[PDB]
């Protein structure tokens, strides 16, 4: 029987917009017929529904702007697996490998990332309630930058899923991940490293999509989150077949960001530099700035994984994860910063390139 799910973090909820997820082997025609069935049954009950998008590639499903009053009925439709209410997400060598960045708009003409990044026509951002390009440019700078970059020889493809305030949606990211899959099917390339420097509350659909994309041979690197909390309560961080990265400072201590800081737990795979990360500033074409967060930490791992895959392209996702762990600096982080019971669960590993 079909189940309904919504973000446990109440402020992050976005009511009136629903992701109707269908059973794994549902065809596009079946999904489209189901959206029309829903539209017809709703109109018959005097309800106005709009089909915003129909998913195919990773998950059989559709996006629908409608009243909640219709959920009991929508749950009764055939092929339906589960329905998730939309929620918000927030910003937090390597030659034969392409890096996909799902983030804010980026400053591609910056002398640090000029030529390296290809700005895709993809844009899916919720409306706001230099500085608009700020977040994305710095992470593109950390990943492949000319002076401060990790994987200098790596090429990037940028997707816009976060607005000028660094806010996105679960659905926005879903459509984004689906776009990567389609681009790969239309024109196949080599190893792919997808960077997600964003996080929202635990999401069944966002995790499910990250699992399918991972099973499809694509490497997914994500931020642990800057909530000083268990990373298993945040998506895409909680998705098991993903590389979840926490942040540490110069003194092998987890990063503190005001009252909050880096996330932890059994969901985090390893940690990487996250305090005082110098990179591309969108202020001017030659400008540099120091930023912090689990985004900068994930960007280092995205650079390391690019260099590692460029050197060994036949590696399976399980093999690469072993390489990341094997080459990491072991038992260096101060366990005493994390809550008492999380210490045994949190892996004491700091990402490093082979010598």
């Amino acid at each position: 029987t079909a189940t309904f799910h919504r973000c446990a973090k109440d402020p992050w909820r976005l009511p009136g917009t629903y992701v109707v997820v269908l059973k794994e082997e549902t065809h596009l025609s079946q999904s489209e017929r189901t959206a029309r069935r829903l539209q017809a049954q709703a109109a018959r009950r005097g309800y106005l529904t709009k089909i915003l998008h129909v998913f195919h590639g990773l998950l059989p499903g559709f996006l629908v702007k409608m009243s909640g009053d219709l959920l009991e009925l929508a749950l009764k439709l055939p092929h339906v697996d589960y329905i998730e209410e939309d929620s918000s997400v927030f910003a937090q060598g390597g030659s034969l490998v392409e890096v996909y960045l799902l983030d804010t708009s980026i400053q591609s003409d910056h002398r640090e990332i000029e030529g390296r990044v290809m700005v895709t026509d993809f844009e899916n951002v919720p409306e706001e309630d230099s500085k608009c390009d700020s977040h994305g440019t710095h992470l593109a700078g950390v990943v492949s930058g000319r002076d401060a970059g990790v994987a200098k020889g790596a090429s990037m493809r940028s997707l816009r899923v976060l607005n000028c305030q660094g806010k996105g949606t679960v659905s926005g990211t879903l459509i984004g991940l689906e776009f990567i899959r389609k681009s790969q099917l239309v024109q196949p390339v080599g190893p792919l490293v997808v960077l997600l420097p964003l996080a929202g509350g635990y999401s069944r659909v966002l995790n499910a999509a990250c699992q399918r994309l991972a099973r499809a041979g694509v490497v997914l690197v994500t931020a642990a989150g800057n909530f000083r909390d268990d990373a298993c309560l945040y998506s895409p961080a909680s998705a098991p077949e993903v590389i979840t990265v926490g942040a540490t400072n110069a003194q092998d201590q987890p990063v503190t960001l005001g009252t909050l800081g880096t996330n932890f737990g059994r969901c985090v795979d390893l940690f990487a530099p996250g305090e005082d990360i110098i990179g591309a500033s969108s202020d001017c074409s030659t400008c540099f700035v120091s930023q912090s967060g689990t985004s900068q930490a994930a960007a280092h791992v995205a650079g390391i994984a690019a260099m590692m895959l460029s050197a060994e392209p036949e590696l399976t996702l399980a093999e690469l994860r072993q390489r990341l762990i094997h080459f990491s600096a072991k038992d260096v982080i101060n366990e005493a910063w994390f809550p008492e019971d999380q210490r045994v669960l949190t892996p004491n590993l700091v990402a490093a390139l082979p010598p």
């Binding site: 990790v150 530099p273 700091v350």
Partner: peptide
């Protein structure tokens, strides 16, 4: 050899 702490820590040669 003036390498930022993060690039030094992850073991990038300068």
């Amino acid at each position: 050899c003036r390498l930022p702490w993060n690039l030094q820590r992850i073991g990038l040669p300068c």
